[PDB]
Design a binder for these strands. Structure first.
Lengths: 117, 64, 143, 201, 37
RNA sequence: UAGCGGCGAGCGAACGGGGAGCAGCCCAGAGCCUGAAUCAGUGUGUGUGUUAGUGGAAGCGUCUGGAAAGGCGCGCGAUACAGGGUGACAGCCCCGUACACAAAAAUGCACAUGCUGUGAGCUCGAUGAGUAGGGCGGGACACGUGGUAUCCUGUCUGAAUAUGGGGGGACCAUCCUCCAAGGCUAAAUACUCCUGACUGACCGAUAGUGAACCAGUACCGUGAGGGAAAGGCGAAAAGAACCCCGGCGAGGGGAGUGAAAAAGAACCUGAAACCGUGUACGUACAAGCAGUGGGAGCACGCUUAGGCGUGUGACUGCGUACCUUUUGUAUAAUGGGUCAGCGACUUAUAUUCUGUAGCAAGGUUAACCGAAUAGGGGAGCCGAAGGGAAACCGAGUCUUAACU
């Protein structure tokens, strides 16, 4: 029972090359380079599902720090204030209020300064 | 083929009742007047092949 | 129903296929490690080879001799001799019952369990315990 | 145990050890796989590197060409080169122990009785050696795919079943596991039932 | 053309010349080796 | 296994048992007696086989379709439903198959028979000499000179000859067995250049022969020798009349055939690398494994605006390929120009362990016979008993004068 291996090899190669559309040059044409490109894209994608949590958090902290200094207190003192005021709003939402609702953020700063004093 | 016995091992080990192998002790062929009689008396009975070496012996003696 | 028969559970184990991929477990080196004499095709040392140290089967002395006569002695239990078809036991009458072998010249009637019928043993050596066991269950031993 | 005859409406007394035991599916599977393996004429050979029609001249010098080193034009890596582990004609027979063969037949006969795939007739013979007569006879008995098994092999029945595809006539001596399992219904003559019990003890 | 190309690839497969790399290519490898000693 | 063995690596019997097959004879030598069985060579007759052959069952309607053997409906053959072809898949269209027959002639085999040659059978006698054996050297015996029997002989020698001689594993004696120094002999057995039939959990064009094709060719080499690549239009050539561009071209565009000519001979399918044309987006102040996480804008589709999907991707965080070998590689260490095809833990036989199945103090047969994967075949192997170097003893045994 000789098994020719054309049809299944074609299917594997094609699977990998479909996962590499949009890559520059051989990275999207040649199998032997698109295999490495697809794997290295896999490793980066893993690594960056962790980094997007780190990057979004540092973005939010920069926005709360900006808006809170606009209301006359730093980020450090603001988070200490709200923790002592026993407010448990996470900082995705504090960043989002700090962009969209300036008056609510002003009131949060008043709770923070009220408890912090 | 059929497995050939390592033939000079069959002359030196002999199988026992629970699968172990007995052998004659070394050191009792010549130079003998220098040895104590306590050595020589303790080298006369036959002895079991130790745990380390049964692998080798079973490999050399596949029909015994 | 030939497409519904199926083997037992545990009887057909897979079979190691070496050299196929990373997932399989045995790819690249097939389970034989890095370089050396053992990772080589045909590679391996012979039996009883300890590096060059004098091997165990060759640093120990040789003893004994082979008898020539122990190859024609036999050893009859008492579980048989109810199998002899006759109630009389000689070397033939045992050979005829496929119980000793044709080349056998000497035989012996070791106590190895449970004679029942009265048996007349002729021309065979009998051990002590089995003389008592043959004579206890009826029986007769002449020589 | 009793087998109800189809036409005479009697009951044939059989052994419970032969026609009334359990189905050992593992045992039957071993005897079926072994029977089918015994049918393989294992005739084939590829050419190793030694048998390929070439020369043992080394195709280029060992060193200095920038080519990879090669030594024979019959290497298995080379096109036209000789199979690495080329096959030889081989025997595919398995040993089936006699008590495992008989055990397997006892299991399959017990399941042909238990699944109503076993028909016991008193006589089953055809008038003339015509396939038309056997076709009409099997049509009257509501049987299309059938293994007729008779204790005395009739000549006319054998010639009448030789063109019918689904129908096979055997003597009671030469039954095999794969046909008792293969055919939908097995029709045994009563004499064949007695001979089967003599075979299978 | 294909036959002449297979034979004319087969030209320096069994060579001997040591000062020429691969039988034909001129070099200075005699002086390179000789100076390395 | 016993043994042989720098007692290493390894080599490795016989006796005896089971089967296949079975067959015995002649000369060394005279008389009686003849053609007496015996084969060999030939003629003839019979039987059978080979080399050409002959007959050989049984179907139509309708739907899809280029075409029906396909679907649906209703029939018939079958000692014939092995197979191949026919415009798709046919038991009933064709060739065949089962079955039943056929040879003027030449032949193979087997009986019968004619002739020739050959010799039966009886009594008595003989019963293989430079030979057996020996010394020296070497070889074959499983046996390597060893305590080495036995066989063969290059060299030197050298008997007895049935009141005799050979062997029985140094050797002697006793006992048993056999008759060398002359020869013939079927079957079981081994093999396939070659022919026929059939079969394949063999290959299907980089495979299978090196060779599916005018292949041991082209080609290479002084020579011996080495040694390729290369299959497939269509059901049928109906293989493109004629017209136009063009050099009375090449190539093309129509026309026509065709079910289909991106089925047009550079011909089934028609992948990938590689090269183009067209459209959307980005890209000419921006540094690096070229992605990834975020992400504006733009273009197409939507969408009861639901704010989505696809393509692109400014800008921005992070980010030095894969393999291999290594203490450690982005490494400026190895390998790879890319694609496509092939390319590496197999097979056989023994032995051990695990799983599983059968039977169980028993399990199982091998060769072979074969109604032949059945059933016979228990020769044998393994186990139920060990100890001891061995005799021997035996649930004990060995050690030892004997064992707390």
């Amino acid at each position: 029972a000789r098994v020719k291996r054309g049809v299944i090899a074609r299917a594997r190669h094609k699977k990998i090359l479909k996962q590499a559309k949009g890559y520059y040059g051989a990275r999207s044409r040649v199998y032997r380079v698109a295999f490495q490109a697809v794997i290295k894209a896999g490793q980066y994608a893993y690594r960056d599902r962790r980094q997007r949590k780190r990057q979004f958090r540092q973005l939010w902290i920069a926005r709360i720090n900006a808006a809170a200094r606009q209301n006359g207190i730093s980020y450090s003192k603001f988070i200490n204030g709200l923790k002592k005021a026993s407010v448990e709003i996470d900082r995705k939402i504090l960043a989002d209020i700090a962009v969209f609702d300036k008056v609510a953020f002003t009131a949060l700063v008043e709770k923070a300064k009220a408890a912090l004093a | 083929p059929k497995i050939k016995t390592v033939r000079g091992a069959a002359k030196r080990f002999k199988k026992t009742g629970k699968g172990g192998f007995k052998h004659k002790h070394a050191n009792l062929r010549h130079i003998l007047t220098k040895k104590a009689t306590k050595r020589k008396r303790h080298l006369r009975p036959k002895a079991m092949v130790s745990k380390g070496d049964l692998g080798l012996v079973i490999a050399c003696l596949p029909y015994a | 129903r030939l497409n519904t028969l199926s083997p037992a559970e545990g009887s057909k184990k897979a079979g190691k296929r070496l050299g196929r991929g990373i997932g399989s477990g045995l790819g690249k080196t097939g389970g034989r490690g890095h370089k050396g004499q053992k990772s080589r095709s045909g590679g391996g040392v012979r039996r009883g080879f300890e590096g060059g140290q004098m091997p165990l089967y060759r640093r120990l002395p040789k003893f004994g001799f082979t008898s020539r006569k122990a190859a024609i002695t036999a050893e009859i239990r008492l579980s048989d001799l109810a199998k002899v078809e006759g109630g009389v036991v000689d070397l033939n009458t045992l050979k005829a019952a496929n119980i000793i072998g044709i080349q056998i010249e000497f035989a012996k009637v070791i106590l190895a369990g449970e004679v029942t019928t009265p048996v007349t043993v002729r021309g065979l050596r009998v051990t002590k315990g089995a003389r008592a066991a043959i004579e206890a269950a009826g029986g007769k031993i002449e020589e | 145990m009793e087998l109800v005859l189809k036409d005479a409406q009697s009951a044939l007394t059989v052994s419970e050890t032969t026609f009334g035991r359990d189905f050992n599916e593992a045992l039957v599977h071993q005897v079926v796989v072994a029977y089918a393996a015994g049918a393989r004429q294992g005739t084939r050979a590829q050419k190793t590197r030694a048998e390929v029609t070439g020369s043992g001249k080394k195709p280029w010098r060992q060193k200095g060409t920038g080519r990879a080193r090669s030594g024979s034009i019959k290497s298995p890596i080379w096109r036209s080169g000789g199979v690495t582990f080329a096959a030889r004609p081989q025997d595919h027979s398995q040993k089936v122990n006699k008590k495992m063969y008989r055990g397997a037949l006892k299991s399959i006969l017990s399941e042909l009785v238990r699944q109503d795939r076993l028909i016991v007739v008193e006589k089953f013979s055809v008038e003339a050696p015509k396939t038309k007569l056997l076709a009409q006879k099997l049509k009257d008995m509501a049987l299309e795919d059938v293994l007729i098994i008779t204790g005395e092999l009739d000549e006319n029945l054998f010639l009448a079943a030789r063109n019918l595809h689904k129908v096979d006539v055997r003597d009671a001596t030469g039954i095999d596991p794969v046909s008792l399992i293969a055919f939908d219904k097995v029709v045994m003559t009563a004499d064949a039932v007695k001979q089967v019990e003599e075979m299978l003890a | 053309m294909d036959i002449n190309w297979r034979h004319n690839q087969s030209t320096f497969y069994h060579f001997t010349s040591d000062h020429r790399i691969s039988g034909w290519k001129e070099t200075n490898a005699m002086y390179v080796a000789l100076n390395s000693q």
